[PDB]
Amino acid sequence: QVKPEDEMDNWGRLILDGVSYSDMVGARDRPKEITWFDYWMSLANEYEQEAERKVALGHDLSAGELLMSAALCAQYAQFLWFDERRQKGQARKVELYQKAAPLLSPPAERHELVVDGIPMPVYVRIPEGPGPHPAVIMLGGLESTKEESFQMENLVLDRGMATATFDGPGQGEMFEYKRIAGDYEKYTSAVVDLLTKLEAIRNDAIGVLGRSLGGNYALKSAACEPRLAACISWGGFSDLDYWDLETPLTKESWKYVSKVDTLEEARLHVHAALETRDVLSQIACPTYILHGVHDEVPLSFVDTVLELVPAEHLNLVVEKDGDHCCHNLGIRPRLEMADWLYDVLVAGKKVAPTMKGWPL
Amino acid sequence: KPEDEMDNWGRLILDGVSYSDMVGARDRPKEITWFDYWMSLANEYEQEAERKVALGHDLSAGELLMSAALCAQYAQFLWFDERRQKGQARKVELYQKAAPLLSPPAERHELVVDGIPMPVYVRIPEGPGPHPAVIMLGGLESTKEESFQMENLVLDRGMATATFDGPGQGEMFEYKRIAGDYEKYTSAVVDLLTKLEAIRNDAIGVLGRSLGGNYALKSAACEPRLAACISWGGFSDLDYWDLETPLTKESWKYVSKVDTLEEARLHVHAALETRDVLSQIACPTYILHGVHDEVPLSFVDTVLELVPAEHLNLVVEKDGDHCCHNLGIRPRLEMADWLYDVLVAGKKVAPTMKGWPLE
Ligand code: NA
Ligand code: NA
C-alpha cells in the first residue's frame, strides 16, 4: 500500500547516509518527464566533473567528498530500480567509489579476495595513529552495499576502530556472480581471515555490524563464527515468517536478488536461505539488536531473539518511534551503535546484558 | 511568512540541525511554539550528553552538546519577546560545555575590550605548528556558537579558527548595540592571535557570514595584518533596506536597540558603510553572492568598482539565495579550499571572476 516514489524518497535514510538535502528537494520537485534514475545519475555526473576539477587544483579532501556524493547519487538512482538500466547504475556506483576510496580520509584500501572461486573486493579503512586496530566488518543488505556505509564508517573510525566492507551473494558486485544464498557466514568468515592475517588489526577484537538484511547476516555470521567479538543487528530479522508484511518494492528486491520469476518463488527461496532460529543459540559474542517498532519487521522478531539469543549476550534496544533501521530518528541510534561497538571492541568493558524500551 | 523564515531548511541542515528535528518542528502541534519546541530539544540533547560523559563517550558528548547549542540558537535566532534573552543564554552555556569536548577542542581566551568581556574561542588543527588561522564573524543572528560546520572544514584543511561576539551580537548585545567600528573588535581578535605562538602571524584571514561579510570587508580595509578575506552573503552598505524580509527589519530594530524601523535604518546605514574604505584593502578577497539574495546585485557593482582588481575573487551563484544555503555544501567547500590556497599553500591566486557578468 506504499507508493514507489515514496519508498525511494526515504528522507531519513538518504540524509543520514550523506545525500545532500538540496539534491533531495530537487529530486522531489523534478519535472514529471524526468525519471528518478536519470535525475540522480546526472547529479552523479555533475559531482564527478567537480571532483576532477578539485584534484586538478590539489583539493584532495574535497575531491574525496564529491566522489562520495557522486557514488551516493548512483547508489540511490538504482537501488530500487529493476529494468535493464539497474545494471548500469550498479556499475556506475562501483566505478565512482573506486575513485573516491583513495581520496577519502582515512583512505579505503582495496584487498582483492576470492571466495569459493569468486572475486570479492574488500575495502578497508584504518584510524589515526600507529598499529594495530579493532575492526568492524560492515554488512550491506538488500540494496545497501559497501559504497553506501561511508558515514557509519566515519563514526566508528572516529572512535579508533577500523572498518571492512564487501558485497556477497545477491549483493552489489557479486550479484552477477551469485544469487542470494544460505551460507553468507562463509563470506564474513573469509574476511575475518583477511583481518586476522593483516597485521594492522587486533585479532581478538573483530566485530560485525549488519544493516537491514545485513542485520540478519550479522546474526548468522556470529552464530557460525566463534572468533567474532561483536554482533549488531541494525534493523535485521531472524527469519522470513513476516514476508506478507514486506513493502511492494521490498518484495520486488527479494525476487530480484533471488533471480526467480514470481514472488512466491522468492519467498520460498529466501525463507529457507535466511533462517537463523536453528543457530541463534550458538552466537557467543555481545550482541546488540536495534529494532524500530514501526518496521515492517514485526515484534515477534524481538520475541524470537529474547527466546533464542543467549541471555548473557543480548543488548536489546527497541525504539518505540523507530521505522525500519530507525532512520526516521536521526543520528542518535547510530551514535549509540558506534559507542557500544567502542565499549565492546576498544573500551574492554564487559557490558551487562540489558534491555532498553522493552517491554512496551 | 515568519514560519518560513525560521524554517530555512538549507541554512539549518548545512549548519548541522538534524533533519528529523526539523520535521517535528514543521509538524509540531500548533499549541507548542517554535521557541519551546527547540528549547525542549536542547534540554534533551544536554541530558543525553551528560550520560555520554558519564560513560566515557566524550566524542558523542561533544556532538550532542553541539546539537543542544544549535537547538537553542535556532529557538531564539528570530524571536523578539522576553524569552529571547533566555534563549541566547541557553545557547551560550550549552556551547561552553561543548567546547572542551570538540575534536579538536575550542579553547577559551577571555578578552576584555574597554571594560567589556569578549570571550574568544580558538580551535587548533592536529599535530605540531604553528598554524594559519581563520577568524570567523557572525551576522545579525549568527553567533560564535553557530559556525561549527564551517570550522570543521577549515580545521580539516590545516587552519586554526577563532570566533567571538562583537557589538550587537550574542553575548556582547547586553553591553553594546550594533556599532560603526567593528574593525576594532576584529583587530583585537587578531591581537591575541599575533600574541599566541601556535598561530602564523602572517597567515591570518577573516571569513564573514551574512552581516559578518560586511564586517569582514570593513576589517580587511582597516587591518593591514590580515592575509585573506571572505564576504559570504555580505554587503557594502544598506541602500537596499526596503528589500529586507519582515523578520530581518525586526532584527535590525533589535540589534540597534530602537523602537522604530526608521530609527533602525538611519543608525545601521551609517554604522555599516564600507564604500569610503574598500579601496584600502591590500589582501586576497573572496566574495560569494547569491543572485536571489535580498541583497541586490548593486553590491557586485560596488565591489567590482571599489575592491582593487588584483585582490578580487568574485563568485556569483545564479541559483543561490542568501549565503547560497540552498545550494548545499559545494560553495562552502569552495571557500575552505580557497582559504587553504591563500593561507596554507605558498600560492598566489590570480584575480578571477566566476558567474559574472550575468546571462
Ligand atoms: Na591481524
Ligand atoms: Na602567533
XYZ file of C-alpha atoms and ligand atoms in Angstrom:
721
model
C 0.000 0.000 0.000
C 3.031 2.348 -0.049
C 3.964 4.149 -3.288
C 7.181 3.507 -5.331
C 8.286 7.218 -5.343
C 7.874 7.269 -1.545
C 9.857 4.088 -0.999
C 12.664 5.784 -2.938
C 12.388 9.208 -1.304
C 13.222 7.922 2.186
C 14.285 11.279 3.585
C 15.709 9.853 6.829
C 17.759 7.110 5.201
C 19.201 9.200 2.385
C 20.021 12.282 4.553
C 21.746 10.221 7.289
C 23.711 8.378 4.620
C 25.087 11.691 3.343
C 22.780 12.536 0.423
C 22.507 16.333 0.122
C 19.266 17.888 1.281
C 19.265 20.224 -1.736
C 19.590 17.255 -4.181
C 16.700 15.633 -2.324
C 14.403 18.630 -2.836
C 15.451 18.726 -6.498
C 14.571 15.021 -6.771
C 11.163 15.668 -5.151
C 10.429 18.764 -7.275
C 11.914 17.401 -10.524
C 9.946 17.681 -13.791
C 7.494 14.837 -14.347
C 9.149 13.733 -17.612
C 12.490 13.195 -15.810
C 12.745 9.768 -14.133
C 14.254 9.228 -10.661
C 17.005 7.179 -12.313
C 18.065 9.886 -14.785
C 17.838 12.680 -12.227
C 20.265 11.046 -9.786
C 22.560 9.761 -12.489
C 23.014 13.241 -13.962
C 23.951 14.501 -10.466
C 26.483 11.666 -10.213
C 27.997 13.019 -13.440
C 27.967 16.562 -12.067
C 29.719 15.570 -8.827
C 32.303 13.643 -10.839
C 33.305 16.634 -13.002
C 33.501 18.668 -9.799
C 35.879 16.247 -8.140
C 38.034 16.132 -11.298
C 38.379 19.925 -11.094
C 39.262 19.696 -7.386
C 42.013 17.077 -7.958
C 43.419 19.306 -10.733
C 43.673 22.150 -8.218
C 45.152 19.966 -5.435
C 41.971 19.747 -3.347
C 42.109 16.034 -2.471
C 39.821 16.252 0.599
C 37.027 17.999 -1.344
C 37.534 15.611 -4.286
C 37.005 12.604 -1.985
C 33.795 14.167 -0.647
C 32.472 14.993 -4.132
C 33.219 11.479 -5.336
C 31.353 10.059 -2.303
C 28.441 12.332 -3.226
C 28.554 11.062 -6.850
C 28.675 7.392 -5.756
C 25.747 8.027 -3.394
C 23.756 9.625 -6.243
C 24.435 6.478 -8.322
C 23.560 4.167 -5.369
C 20.246 5.889 -4.886
C 19.335 6.178 -8.590
C 19.421 2.387 -8.944
C 18.783 0.896 -5.502
C 15.050 0.272 -6.176
C 15.263 0.076 -9.984
C 14.589 -3.218 -11.785
C 14.837 -2.692 -15.571
C 17.822 -3.021 -17.975
C 19.410 0.139 -16.551
C 19.771 -1.187 -12.969
C 22.918 -2.966 -14.134
C 24.409 0.310 -15.371
C 23.648 2.195 -12.133
C 25.181 -0.572 -10.043
C 28.269 -0.498 -12.309
C 28.389 3.320 -12.161
C 28.245 3.345 -8.336
C 31.162 0.875 -8.287
C 33.261 2.938 -10.744
C 32.700 6.082 -8.647
C 33.589 4.570 -5.264
C 36.777 3.072 -6.752
C 37.916 6.638 -7.465
C 36.573 8.009 -4.183
C 38.326 5.461 -1.935
C 41.952 6.686 -2.211
C 40.815 10.319 -1.705
C 38.819 9.582 1.449
C 40.497 10.348 4.780
C 41.309 7.876 6.072
C 41.630 6.012 2.713
C 39.659 2.895 1.728
C 42.160 0.232 0.753
C 41.222 -2.466 -1.745
C 42.000 -6.105 -0.932
C 41.028 -8.394 -3.806
C 39.846 -11.550 -2.068
C 38.488 -14.672 -3.819
C 35.743 -16.680 -2.022
C 34.605 -20.093 -3.341
C 36.485 -19.119 -6.508
C 34.607 -15.833 -6.888
C 36.317 -12.407 -6.799
C 35.248 -10.257 -3.843
C 36.800 -6.803 -3.419
C 37.248 -5.872 0.252
C 37.525 -2.174 1.218
C 39.333 -1.429 4.482
C 39.697 1.845 6.395
C 42.245 2.450 9.219
C 42.106 5.069 12.037
C 44.700 7.603 13.196
C 47.950 6.525 14.914
C 50.404 3.504 14.877
C 49.000 -0.080 14.550
C 47.033 -2.360 15.374
C 43.236 -1.634 15.486
C 39.903 -3.242 16.206
C 37.765 -3.768 13.122
C 34.102 -3.616 12.365
C 33.076 -5.676 9.364
C 30.070 -3.887 7.892
C 27.362 -5.861 6.116
C 25.118 -4.478 3.386
C 21.525 -5.516 2.879
C 19.007 -5.928 0.122
C 20.217 -2.755 -1.676
C 22.764 -1.314 0.797
C 26.253 -2.214 -0.468
C 29.850 -1.408 0.501
C 29.742 2.042 -1.238
C 26.878 3.334 0.970
C 28.120 2.913 4.579
C 30.526 5.946 4.499
C 29.018 7.947 7.379
C 28.581 4.933 9.676
C 32.236 4.083 8.879
C 33.271 7.612 9.859
C 31.546 7.300 13.236
C 33.473 4.118 14.223
C 36.774 5.294 12.669
C 36.448 8.441 14.836
C 36.264 6.060 17.780
C 39.508 4.257 16.837
C 38.035 1.225 15.068
C 38.912 0.147 11.513
C 36.146 -0.792 9.044
C 35.815 -3.520 6.394
C 33.120 -3.647 3.667
C 32.170 -6.145 0.908
C 29.372 -7.381 -1.352
C 28.490 -11.070 -1.049
C 25.788 -13.247 -2.664
C 22.929 -11.274 -4.240
C 24.685 -8.013 -3.398
C 26.237 -5.278 -5.473
C 29.264 -6.565 -7.324
C 28.711 -10.278 -6.620
C 25.021 -10.344 -7.754
C 26.152 -11.061 -11.332
C 28.213 -13.984 -9.943
C 25.810 -15.364 -7.286
C 22.148 -15.007 -6.374
C 21.251 -14.621 -2.691
C 22.398 -17.662 -0.646
C 22.005 -19.586 2.606
C 25.658 -19.546 3.707
C 26.558 -15.823 3.920
C 28.650 -16.617 7.042
C 31.440 -18.062 4.844
C 31.780 -14.593 3.268
C 32.063 -12.769 6.610
C 34.378 -15.629 7.739
C 36.765 -15.267 4.751
C 37.013 -11.578 5.649
C 37.888 -12.290 9.322
C 40.711 -14.388 7.797
C 41.979 -11.371 5.901
C 41.827 -9.269 9.095
C 43.461 -11.981 11.237
C 46.236 -12.030 8.588
C 46.622 -8.237 8.199
C 48.982 -7.117 10.950
C 47.286 -3.691 11.267
C 44.300 -5.359 13.017
C 43.777 -6.824 16.510
C 42.746 -10.481 16.051
C 40.757 -10.790 19.279
C 38.980 -7.554 18.512
C 36.909 -8.149 15.322
C 33.194 -7.424 15.349
C 30.365 -7.335 12.816
C 27.791 -4.619 12.098
C 24.907 -5.547 9.829
C 22.326 -3.175 8.374
C 18.796 -4.287 7.310
C 19.184 -7.709 5.610
C 22.806 -7.289 6.803
C 21.239 -7.416 10.264
C 20.119 -10.970 9.525
C 23.532 -11.754 8.006
C 25.299 -10.463 11.140
C 23.340 -12.780 13.450
C 24.086 -15.652 11.051
C 27.784 -14.745 10.830
C 28.012 -14.584 14.643
C 26.128 -17.858 15.219
C 28.642 -19.547 12.926
C 31.864 -17.643 13.743
C 33.449 -18.080 17.292
C 36.212 -15.539 16.525
C 33.842 -12.505 16.161
C 33.765 -10.362 19.332
C 30.574 -8.360 18.407
C 27.307 -8.660 16.676
C 24.980 -5.784 15.824
C 21.690 -6.423 14.084
C 20.624 -2.991 12.883
C 17.087 -3.275 11.567
C 17.640 -7.008 10.923
C 15.465 -10.132 11.284
C 15.661 -13.811 12.383
C 13.514 -15.458 9.677
C 11.023 -14.679 6.929
C 7.743 -15.674 8.596
C 6.876 -11.982 8.244
C 7.043 -11.948 4.391
C 3.473 -10.730 3.704
C 4.225 -7.596 5.711
C 7.002 -6.543 3.292
C 6.565 -3.417 1.200
C 5.898 -3.896 -2.556
C 9.414 -2.842 -3.627
C 11.000 -4.977 -0.923
C 9.115 -7.986 -2.363
C 10.462 -6.878 -5.790
C 14.044 -6.733 -4.360
C 13.662 -10.237 -2.860
C 12.616 -11.539 -6.294
C 15.407 -9.537 -7.965
C 18.173 -10.803 -5.686
C 16.886 -14.417 -5.917
C 16.710 -14.327 -9.726
C 13.303 -16.009 -9.777
C 10.131 -15.255 -11.711
C 7.431 -14.970 -9.077
C 7.113 -13.534 -5.558
C 6.212 -16.930 -4.110
C 9.308 -18.470 -5.684
C 11.325 -15.662 -3.976
C 9.608 -16.091 -0.633
C 10.318 -19.836 -0.787
C 13.942 -19.390 -1.587
C 14.642 -16.584 0.893
C 12.663 -18.150 3.783
C 14.869 -21.272 3.723
C 18.131 -19.442 2.880
C 17.882 -16.791 5.594
C 16.605 -18.820 8.591
C 18.630 -18.409 11.801
C 16.380 -19.807 14.572
C 18.216 -23.158 14.482
C 21.541 -21.451 15.316
C 20.776 -18.253 17.338
C 21.665 -20.233 20.483
C 25.284 -20.572 19.241
C 26.057 -16.791 18.992
C 28.801 -16.491 21.608
C 29.513 -12.712 21.473
C 27.994 -9.443 22.857
C 25.008 -8.852 20.616
C 23.325 -5.521 20.129
C 19.864 -5.548 18.490
C 18.377 -2.206 17.358
C 14.742 -2.577 16.488
C 12.240 0.014 15.292
C 8.681 -0.742 16.397
C 7.237 0.658 13.154
C 9.462 -1.533 10.997
C 7.787 -3.960 8.595
C 9.814 -6.441 10.631
C 7.319 -7.156 13.435
C 7.814 -7.555 17.197
C 7.808 -11.380 17.061
C 11.416 -10.956 15.989
C 12.051 -9.305 19.365
C 10.274 -12.286 20.955
C 12.434 -14.695 18.953
C 15.733 -13.085 19.931
C 14.788 -12.927 23.637
C 13.732 -16.585 23.356
C 16.862 -17.691 21.472
C 19.943 -15.406 21.773
C 21.836 -16.339 24.985
C 20.575 -14.010 27.763
C 24.172 -13.239 28.813
C 24.987 -11.688 25.408
C 21.851 -9.771 24.436
C 21.812 -5.956 24.419
C 18.276 -5.169 23.244
C 17.244 -1.700 22.140
C 13.722 -1.180 20.891
C 12.822 2.311 19.706
C 9.064 2.942 20.029
C 9.066 5.629 17.302
C 11.590 3.905 15.054
C 10.873 2.941 11.486
C 12.965 0.411 9.589
C 16.592 0.804 10.818
C 15.258 3.742 12.883
C 16.350 6.088 10.063
C 13.488 8.476 10.965
C 15.028 9.088 14.414
C 18.198 10.909 13.292
C 21.805 10.266 14.247
C 21.217 9.288 17.945
C 20.790 5.485 17.385
C 23.863 5.417 15.079
C 25.994 7.159 17.733
C 24.768 4.666 20.320
C 25.731 1.799 17.998
C 29.268 3.184 17.443
C 29.788 3.928 21.172
C 28.686 0.374 22.099
C 30.962 -1.089 19.367
C 33.678 1.106 21.156
C 32.728 -0.353 24.593
C 32.985 -3.941 23.360
C 35.880 -3.714 20.917
C 38.074 -0.752 22.077
C 36.874 0.043 25.714
C 37.280 -3.777 27.070
C 34.139 -3.047 29.157
C 32.399 -6.322 29.889
C 28.929 -4.886 29.272
C 25.934 -6.263 31.201
C 23.139 -7.963 29.217
C 20.463 -5.291 29.074
C 17.117 -4.076 27.716
C 16.042 -0.623 26.576
C 12.398 0.108 25.681
C 11.256 -3.480 26.223
C 8.572 -4.442 27.179
C 6.318 -1.639 25.833
C 5.823 34.124 6.484
C 7.605 34.247 9.883
C 7.403 30.449 9.961
C 9.089 30.105 6.527
C 11.912 32.445 7.539
C 12.528 30.337 10.686
C 12.322 27.059 8.672
C 15.298 27.841 6.460
C 15.927 24.232 5.509
C 19.197 24.768 3.657
C 20.672 27.018 6.368
C 19.677 24.850 9.296
C 20.590 21.480 7.703
C 24.018 22.668 6.457
C 24.696 24.144 9.898
C 24.065 20.746 11.449
C 20.483 20.807 12.667
C 19.022 17.312 12.447
C 16.553 16.710 9.582
C 14.477 14.565 11.960
C 14.386 17.543 14.326
C 13.231 19.885 11.541
C 10.394 17.598 10.503
C 8.965 17.593 14.046
C 9.314 21.385 14.033
C 7.283 21.749 10.795
C 4.787 19.140 12.109
C 4.677 20.332 15.747
C 1.251 20.529 17.455
C 0.084 24.115 16.862
C -0.191 24.789 20.624
C 3.549 24.174 21.016
C 5.579 27.171 19.973
C 8.709 27.290 17.774
C 10.764 28.615 20.707
C 9.577 25.931 23.155
C 9.948 23.163 20.590
C 13.636 23.825 20.065
C 14.406 24.656 23.691
C 12.834 21.343 24.765
C 15.154 19.585 22.293
C 18.307 21.302 23.590
C 17.500 20.079 27.089
C 17.067 16.525 25.817
C 20.348 16.810 23.896
C 22.098 18.094 27.030
C 20.808 15.208 29.142
C 21.989 12.560 26.643
C 25.396 14.246 26.544
C 25.744 14.057 30.350
C 25.053 10.304 30.169
C 27.723 10.020 27.495
C 30.376 11.891 29.542
C 29.483 9.598 32.458
C 30.177 6.572 30.225
C 33.447 7.790 28.730
C 31.854 8.584 25.352
C 33.478 12.035 25.168
C 33.240 12.260 21.356
C 29.443 11.742 21.265
C 29.097 14.041 24.290
C 30.547 16.971 22.308
C 28.381 16.311 19.266
C 25.228 16.144 21.399
C 26.114 19.340 23.282
C 26.782 20.910 19.871
C 23.264 19.715 18.921
C 21.861 21.271 22.109
C 23.503 24.639 21.429
C 22.095 24.769 17.870
C 18.566 23.911 19.008
C 18.942 26.791 21.479
C 20.349 29.102 18.785
C 17.543 28.287 16.359
C 14.827 28.571 19.023
C 15.923 32.144 19.657
C 17.537 33.476 16.444
C 14.382 35.286 15.181
C 12.477 35.684 18.488
C 11.965 39.149 19.960
C 9.928 38.925 23.192
C 11.265 38.431 26.735
C 12.296 34.800 26.175
C 14.830 35.915 23.546
C 17.479 36.647 26.218
C 16.878 33.262 27.919
C 17.294 31.537 24.556
C 20.553 33.391 23.951
C 21.853 32.483 27.446
C 20.930 28.787 26.987
C 22.931 28.662 23.740
C 25.913 30.373 25.427
C 26.060 27.949 28.377
C 25.468 24.882 26.200
C 28.358 25.722 23.880
C 30.668 26.411 26.849
C 30.233 22.779 27.862
C 30.571 21.519 24.260
C 33.811 23.374 23.534
C 36.324 21.262 25.506
C 34.719 18.067 24.103
C 35.053 19.111 20.446
C 37.541 17.404 18.155
C 39.666 19.480 18.085
C 38.689 21.380 21.312
C 37.561 25.012 21.214
C 39.752 26.847 23.736
C 38.508 29.826 25.715
C 40.554 33.037 25.709
C 38.946 35.693 27.872
C 39.345 39.173 26.430
C 38.075 42.481 27.763
C 37.591 45.358 25.309
C 37.120 48.610 27.212
C 35.566 47.095 30.382
C 33.517 44.739 28.192
C 34.108 40.961 28.325
C 34.673 39.375 24.928
C 35.031 35.538 25.103
C 37.147 34.238 22.189
C 37.161 30.553 21.192
C 40.142 29.103 19.390
C 40.400 25.680 17.716
C 43.750 24.153 16.736
C 44.469 21.583 13.983
C 46.244 18.268 14.758
C 49.994 17.621 15.273
C 52.640 20.375 15.575
C 52.505 24.008 14.371
C 52.451 26.941 14.045
C 49.111 27.116 12.214
C 47.352 29.563 9.901
C 44.120 30.896 11.462
C 40.706 31.961 10.278
C 38.748 34.490 12.270
C 35.063 33.813 11.631
C 32.475 36.565 12.021
C 28.817 36.039 12.873
C 25.993 38.132 11.460
C 22.728 39.646 12.534
C 21.780 36.428 14.383
C 24.685 34.068 13.606
C 26.950 33.939 16.675
C 30.215 32.149 17.621
C 28.295 29.013 18.643
C 26.835 28.626 15.140
C 29.862 28.082 12.867
C 30.881 24.557 13.966
C 30.370 23.127 10.441
C 32.400 25.749 8.600
C 35.043 25.402 11.323
C 35.481 21.654 10.765
C 36.002 22.142 7.011
C 38.844 24.622 7.575
C 40.333 22.638 10.520
C 40.302 19.587 8.204
C 42.353 21.710 5.843
C 45.078 22.756 8.337
C 43.817 26.154 9.549
C 43.037 27.309 13.095
C 39.691 29.040 13.759
C 38.695 31.881 16.097
C 35.158 33.001 16.983
C 33.703 35.825 19.119
C 30.613 38.036 19.518
C 31.043 41.704 18.580
C 28.821 44.770 19.024
C 25.121 43.966 18.714
C 25.836 40.239 18.636
C 25.313 37.396 21.032
C 26.987 37.885 24.384
C 28.008 41.448 23.687
C 24.493 42.625 22.794
C 23.866 43.297 26.509
C 26.763 45.773 26.600
C 26.799 47.182 23.106
C 24.228 47.580 20.342
C 25.366 47.318 16.716
C 28.261 49.774 16.029
C 30.253 51.613 13.360
C 33.666 50.388 14.434
C 33.519 46.579 14.285
C 37.056 46.665 12.806
C 38.172 47.478 16.347
C 36.961 44.131 17.783
C 38.301 42.100 14.834
C 41.763 43.689 15.303
C 41.617 42.703 18.972
C 40.972 39.204 17.982
C 43.963 39.472 15.637
C 45.991 40.980 18.551
C 45.519 37.781 20.592
C 46.329 35.607 17.566
C 49.511 37.635 16.934
C 50.460 37.000 20.586
C 49.691 33.222 20.661
C 52.717 31.295 19.427
C 50.757 28.377 17.933
C 49.438 30.669 15.112
C 51.171 32.003 11.958
C 51.246 35.899 12.350
C 51.457 36.483 8.583
C 48.797 33.809 7.972
C 45.511 35.197 9.492
C 42.420 35.646 7.297
C 38.836 36.742 8.024
C 35.615 34.909 6.993
C 32.411 36.885 7.498
C 28.949 35.217 7.275
C 25.957 37.349 6.181
C 26.221 40.672 8.089
C 29.530 39.108 9.101
C 30.614 39.562 5.458
C 30.155 43.342 5.727
C 32.275 43.215 8.913
C 34.891 41.092 7.082
C 35.178 43.704 4.336
C 35.334 46.542 6.885
C 38.091 44.759 8.841
C 40.258 43.905 5.804
C 40.103 47.559 4.749
C 41.149 48.752 8.215
C 43.622 45.986 9.107
C 46.905 45.684 7.105
C 47.764 42.470 9.073
C 45.061 40.407 7.562
C 46.326 37.935 4.900
C 42.893 36.925 3.480
C 39.165 37.966 3.311
C 35.828 36.323 2.555
C 32.455 38.054 2.242
C 29.886 35.253 2.459
C 26.394 36.685 1.870
C 27.761 40.072 2.901
C 27.090 43.615 1.648
C 28.787 47.022 1.309
C 26.008 49.353 2.538
C 22.282 49.398 3.408
C 20.778 51.273 0.415
C 18.696 48.129 -0.163
C 16.876 48.362 3.232
C 13.260 48.113 1.928
C 14.138 44.775 0.298
C 14.784 43.081 3.675
C 12.342 40.437 4.911
C 9.940 41.477 7.741
C 11.989 39.492 10.303
C 15.300 40.948 9.143
C 13.984 44.503 9.676
C 12.848 43.373 13.141
C 16.359 42.074 13.826
C 17.870 45.383 12.635
C 15.484 47.169 15.050
C 16.502 44.771 17.801
C 20.303 44.962 17.460
C 20.010 48.756 17.246
C 18.029 48.932 20.495
C 15.482 51.321 18.961
C 11.672 51.262 18.889
C 11.107 52.093 15.207
C 12.167 50.965 11.743
C 13.393 54.379 10.510
C 15.467 54.840 13.690
C 16.967 51.413 12.996
C 17.549 52.215 9.328
C 19.238 55.563 9.973
C 21.586 54.059 12.576
C 22.641 50.910 10.703
C 23.070 52.544 7.301
C 25.575 54.980 8.861
C 27.296 52.437 11.137
C 27.734 49.810 8.394
C 29.007 51.831 5.424
C 32.189 50.473 3.787
C 32.283 52.244 0.419
C 34.614 55.016 1.617
C 37.104 52.395 2.743
C 37.007 49.307 0.410
C 39.846 50.500 -1.875
C 42.198 50.464 1.174
C 42.098 46.535 1.206
C 45.555 45.001 0.469
C 44.720 41.257 0.794
C 43.142 38.419 -1.248
C 39.352 38.911 -1.187
C 36.696 36.277 -1.988
C 33.112 37.460 -2.441
C 30.331 34.888 -2.755
C 26.966 36.404 -3.651
C 23.744 34.525 -4.443
C 21.665 36.195 -7.149
C 18.366 35.690 -5.277
C 19.707 37.212 -2.041
C 17.597 40.150 -0.758
C 20.960 41.895 -1.130
C 20.750 43.239 -4.723
C 23.361 42.844 -7.467
C 24.247 46.520 -6.937
C 26.636 45.141 -4.305
C 28.509 43.347 -7.091
C 28.758 46.692 -8.967
C 30.091 48.387 -5.817
C 32.767 45.748 -5.069
C 33.986 45.497 -8.697
C 34.309 49.247 -8.736
C 35.846 49.671 -5.281
C 37.675 46.483 -4.231
C 41.041 46.734 -6.100
C 41.312 44.373 -9.094
C 44.437 42.360 -8.123
C 42.737 41.072 -4.944
C 39.176 40.310 -6.066
C 37.974 36.752 -6.480
C 34.261 37.173 -7.335
C 31.833 34.180 -7.270
C 28.217 34.836 -8.303
C 25.854 31.854 -7.899
C 22.801 32.367 -10.134
C 20.536 29.911 -8.209
C 21.828 30.922 -4.790
C 19.720 32.577 -2.150
C 21.122 34.426 0.885
C 24.549 32.897 1.681
C 23.809 30.302 -1.064
C 22.440 27.962 1.640
C 20.023 26.435 -0.864
C 22.974 25.118 -2.957
C 24.297 22.620 -0.403
C 27.852 22.203 0.752
C 29.682 22.950 -2.515
C 30.069 26.749 -2.160
C 31.313 26.168 1.449
C 33.899 23.625 0.245
C 34.978 26.235 -2.345
C 35.566 28.817 0.408
C 37.502 26.424 2.688
C 39.772 25.370 -0.230
C 40.342 28.985 -1.327
C 41.434 29.888 2.194
C 43.648 26.809 2.018
C 45.302 28.145 -1.158
C 45.860 31.609 0.292
C 46.816 30.704 3.890
C 48.355 27.222 3.726
C 49.755 26.864 0.200
C 52.636 29.071 -0.948
C 50.040 30.098 -3.508
C 49.423 33.445 -5.191
C 45.901 33.128 -6.619
C 45.184 35.451 -9.568
C 42.167 37.853 -9.849
C 39.411 35.598 -11.208
C 35.675 36.115 -11.782
C 33.009 33.382 -11.827
C 29.286 33.696 -12.655
C 29.692 37.316 -13.777
C 28.638 39.065 -15.988
C 25.065 37.725 -15.738
C 23.311 35.986 -18.665
Na 45.798 -9.254 12.137
Na 51.093 33.951 16.751
